[PDB]
Amino acid sequence: CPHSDTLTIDPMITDLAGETSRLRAAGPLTRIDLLGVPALAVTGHTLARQLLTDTRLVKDINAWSLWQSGTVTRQWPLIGMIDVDRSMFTVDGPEHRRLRIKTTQALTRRRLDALKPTIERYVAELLDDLERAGADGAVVDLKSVFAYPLPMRVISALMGVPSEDQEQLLTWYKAFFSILTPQDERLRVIDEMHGYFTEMVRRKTAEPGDDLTSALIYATDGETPLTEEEVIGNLQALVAAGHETTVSLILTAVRALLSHPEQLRLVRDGEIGWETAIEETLRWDGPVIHLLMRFATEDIDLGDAVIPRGEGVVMSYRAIGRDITVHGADADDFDITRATAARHISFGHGPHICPGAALARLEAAIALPALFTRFPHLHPALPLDQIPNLPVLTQNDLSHFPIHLGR
Ligand code: HEM
Ligand SMILES: C[C@]12CCC(=O)C=C1CC[C@@H]1[C@@H]2CC[C@]2(C)C(=O)CC[C@@H]12
Ligand SMILES: [K+]
Ligand SMILES: [Mg+2]
Numbered sequence: 001c002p003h004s005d006t007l008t009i010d011p012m013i014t015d016l017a018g019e020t021s022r023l024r025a026a027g028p029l030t031r032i033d034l035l036g037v038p039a040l041a042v043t044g045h046t047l048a049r050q051l052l053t054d055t056r057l058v059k060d061i062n063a064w065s066l067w068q069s070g071t072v073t074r075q076w077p078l079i080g081m082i083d084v085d086r087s088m089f090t091v092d093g094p095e096h097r098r099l100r101i102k103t104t105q106a107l108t109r110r111r112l113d114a115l116k117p118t119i120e121r122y123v124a125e126l127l128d129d130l131e132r133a134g135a136d137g138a139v140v141d142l143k144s145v146f147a148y149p150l151p152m153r154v155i156s157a158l159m160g161v162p163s164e165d166q167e168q169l170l171t172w173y174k175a176f177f178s179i180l181t182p183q184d185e186r187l188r189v190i191d192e193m194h195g196y197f198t199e200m201v202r203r204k205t206a207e208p209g210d211d212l213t214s215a216l217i218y219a220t221d222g223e224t225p226l227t228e229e230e231v232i233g234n235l236q237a238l239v240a241a242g243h244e245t246t247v248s249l250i251l252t253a254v255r256a257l258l259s260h261p262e263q264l265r266l267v268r269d270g271e272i273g274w275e276t277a278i279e280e281t282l283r284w285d286g287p288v289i290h291l292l293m294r295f296a297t298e299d300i301d302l303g304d305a306v307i308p309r310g311e312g313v314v315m316s317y318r319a320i321g322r323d324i325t326v327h328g329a330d331a332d333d334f335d336i337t338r339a340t341a342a343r344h345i346s347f348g349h350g351p352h353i354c355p356g357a358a359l360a361r362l363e364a365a366i367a368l369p370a371l372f373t374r375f376p377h378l379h380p381a382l383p384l385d386q387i388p389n390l391p392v393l394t395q396n397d398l399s400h401f402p403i404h405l406g407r
């Protein structure tokens with residue numbers, strides 16, 4: 001269809017592959033349209049690396065000229081992705097580290113050793129649900145039975161979300177992410193999520209436990225305490241991210257491996273590490289499509305192009321993972337043996353780099369082999385290429401994943 005010099009991101013995710021190719025080819029910096037709102041998108045690996053460390057690009061929505069003019073408001077269906085409370089997510093500079101430190105420390109690989117048994121238990125529980133559900137050769141939704149609930153259980157255990165509240169959170173998130181949710185109802189869901197997590201912080205304040213939320217509340221020894229807004233802001237970021245991204249990584253890793261059986265075999269037979277298959281999945285078909293937004297505090301000259309003060313900059317991570325300069329001409333193929341499998345930046349780069357990356361990697365490294373060892377003849381009951389995305393513009397969110405447990 002006709003040549004346009006603004007690339008409209010289709011909210012129905014009708015053509016993710018085409019849109020992702022279009023972006024790579026239009027880049028590495030190009031003009032996009034997000035439901036009527038213009039922004040720049042970084043689609044190049046090298047330029048993203050550089051801009052993710054540029055101190056003239058900030059998260060603070062008040063640096064967005066469109067926000068300042070009141071051209072964008074809370075009616076924008078994408079607004080909840082950025083206009084959120086003070087947290088590691090919305091801060092830049094020297095104040096940023098303070099908002100990250102207790103979380104990074106809690107999520108180092110060895111601190112995570114103690115969470116391992118827990119993850120194991122939940123993976124086993126849900127494989128048991130799979131077995132029950134796939135009985136008598138029935139078709140089973142791998143997402144709803146397995147991949148969807150696992151990461152919620154895990155992040156909930158970490159942060160101290162009661163078992164009985166986890167369902168309602170999922171109901172809220174589904175509403176939150178879907179473009180289809182009416183905007184007034186989305187804003188109501190956002191207020192309701194905020195109210196929940198506020199009360200959770202109060203509950204942990206009265207009665208702290210061995211959880212990260214309690215550690216955010218009562219920090220080291222001397223330190224300058226986080227404010228209520230900050231504790232709540234981090235909590236929300238950790239849960240939302242911790243759940244939504246991980247569900248995708250599991251589903252795409254499976255889809256990838258089932259659609260490339262020789263590669264599944266490589267890892268089953270211990271010739272390639274499940275971890276490496278995980279990295280390649282992040283590079284190729286990762287959890288984040290577009291990362292909303294950064295803003296220029298002043299004009300940013302890049303050579304033959306300029307990001308004007310006030311402009312919105314999006315990191316188009318999926319397009320970045322398909323960078324042919326970095327990954328070679330076969331960048332669009334899934335190949336776990338490629339030499340650049342782990343050179344991606346799908347968790348980001350610079351100060352805002354994903355703090356939960358070790359946890360994400362561990363959830364997958366446990367879930368995937370457990371899944372395939374338990375159900376070695378697991379296979380799709382629907383062509384993998386026919387698994388549609390949910391209308392979720394920023395996230396690689398698969399709708400459902402019909403399988404059979406197999407022989
Ligand atoms: C499973 C795959 C995951 C991917 C691909 C992913 C990716 C990302 C990306 C791209 C960012 C922001 C990059 C940017 O600022 O431009 C980010 C930030 C974040 N992620 Fe993740 N993430 C994952 C899992 C998790 C998990 C498991 C948690 C928490 C347990 C988590 C918590 C966060 C938080 C709190 C931030 C905000 C950090 C900041 O702005 O300072 N993520 N992640
Ligand atoms: C915007 C958001 C939800 C609403 C909220 O209150 C707090 C956050 C912060 C983390 C965001 C998350 C939505 C999805 C994001 C973009 C990811 O895929 C990784 C980080 C994560
Ligand atoms: K707000
Ligand atoms: Mg043109």
